[PDB]
Amino acid sequence: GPKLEDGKVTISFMKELMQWYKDQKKLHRKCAYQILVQVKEVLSKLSTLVETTLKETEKITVCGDTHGQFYDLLNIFELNGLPSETNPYIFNGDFVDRGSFSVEVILTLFGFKLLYPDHFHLLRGNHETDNMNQIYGFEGEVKAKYTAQMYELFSEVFEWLPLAQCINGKVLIMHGGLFSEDGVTLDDIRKIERNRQPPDSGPMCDLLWSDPQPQNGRSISKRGVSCQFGPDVTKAFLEENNLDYIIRSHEVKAEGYEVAHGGRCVTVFSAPNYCDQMGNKASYIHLQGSDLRPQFHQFTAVPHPNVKPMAY
């Protein structure tokens, strides 16, 4: 079984872990525990807004929702290469729920965050919250594989996940989207005290829950919290904060991505054939320091073991 080397994640352990998980085996509770406490410490020290500089020769890969589709997560790393200092990643929330290999996804992602803390980035989604985990399978999965106490620890680690990432002061990445009120700025995002369950309304809620709409202005959300926001909302926010565009995730898309609001609101979704039912393609994005324009890479689902969606 995979073991830490002097209580630390190594590239060797991560390879063993991914193979262990491919073969439907469980990471020992002590190792899971250690990954969680160590990554909690890493994440707790980060700003709510992660601000990353991408030099002219450097690239980054942005992935959207993964939703416990562990075998598709491995496929991303086979198509795009494993994470490293020279192949950095952002995973933009919704790692868990729906898919029945959520534990394997999230421990794999936290492992890589510990191995490459400055080059492997995790942003919180609305599915990294208690109400979602309780309904949509992650709580059950953690209780089935480990204990109720292990779940409380996951919840507490999720609370320290940052809420957005800004690349070169120009691309802003969040899970959900923009805001239900006008005049919200990067300063406000930086100052969100994020170690909690999201409020019923406010900036923290919007970052996890909001959705673009084609028509101008805002609308009440079909989801019951946050809002739908139009092209004029995006345009104004970006002009006021000196940004080029936003990358969001949150929603399933048939092509794995959507380019909305005149090129200014991009969706990226990385869970192909969502819940073994939707038949959508997935995508990941490349960005370069010399060119911040998104390059999309589409991909289709790979086989996984016979465990149905939402089993837990």
Of 137 and 162, the one with the shorter C-beta distance to ligand 8D4 is 137
Of 9 and 132, the one with the shorter C-beta distance to Mn ion is 132
Q: Report whether 65 belongs to an annotated binding site.
A: yes
Query: In the Cβ-directed half-sphere of 247, how many Cα atoms lie within 13 Å?
Result: 34
Tally Cβ neighbours within 10 Å of residue 36.
Answer: 18
Of 116 and 257, the one with the shorter C-beta distance to ligand 8D4 is 257
> CA 238 → CA 120, 169, 230, 249, distances in Å?
25, 11, 13, 18
* Residues in Cβ contact with 155 at an 8 Å cutoff, skipping those fewer than 6 apart: 130, 133
Of 244 and 276, the one with the shorter C-beta distance to Mn ion is 276
Q: Report whether 304 belongs to an annotated binding site.
A: no
DSSP β-ladder status, 265-268 and 257-260: antiparallel
128: contact with Mn ion by CB under 5 A:
no
DSSP β-ladder status, 89-92 and 59-63: parallel
What whole-number distance in Å separates Cα of residue 240 and Cα of residue 308? 46
What whole-number distance in Å separates Cα of residue 95 and Cα of residue 219? 27
29-37, 124-132, 192-200, 239-247 -> range binding ligand 8D4 (CB under 6 A): 124-132
Tell which positions 127-146 bind ligand 8D4, by CB under 6 A. Answer: 127, 132, 136
Residue in 48, 66, 126, 221 binding ligand 8D4, rule: CB under 6 A: 126
Residue in 40, 121, 250, 304 binding Mn ion, rule: CB under 5 A: 250
Cα-Cα-Cα-Cα dihedral of 151, 154, 155, 160, to 10°?
Answer: 170
Residue in 125, 198, 203, 230 binding Mn ion, rule: CB under 5 A: 125
What whole-number distance in Å separates Cα of residue 293 and Cα of residue 247? 11
23-31, 35-43, 126-134, 144-152 -> range binding ligand 8D4 (CB under 6 A): 126-134
Q: Report whether 223 belongs to an annotated binding site.
A: yes
Residue 98 binds what, of ligand 8D4, Mn ion, none (CB under 5 to 8 Å, by partner type)?
ligand 8D4
Active site residue 121: no
Of 132 and 204, the one with the shorter C-beta distance to ligand 8D4 is 132
What is the H or E stretch that residue 295 is in? Answer: strand 295-299
Q: Based on the number of CB atoms within 10 Å of its own CB, is 287 exposed (0-12), middle (13-18) or buried (19 or more)?
A: buried
3-state SS class at 142: helix
Catalytic residue, from 119, 127, 261, 304: name it.
127
Query: Annotated binding site for substrate: which residue ranges?
Result: 67, 98, 126-127, 223, 250
Active-site residue set: 127
Q: Residues in the site for ligand 8D4, rule: CB under 6 A?
A: 94, 98, 126-127, 132, 136, 250
Query: Annotated binding site: which residue ranges?
Result: 65, 67, 94, 98, 126-127, 175, 223, 250
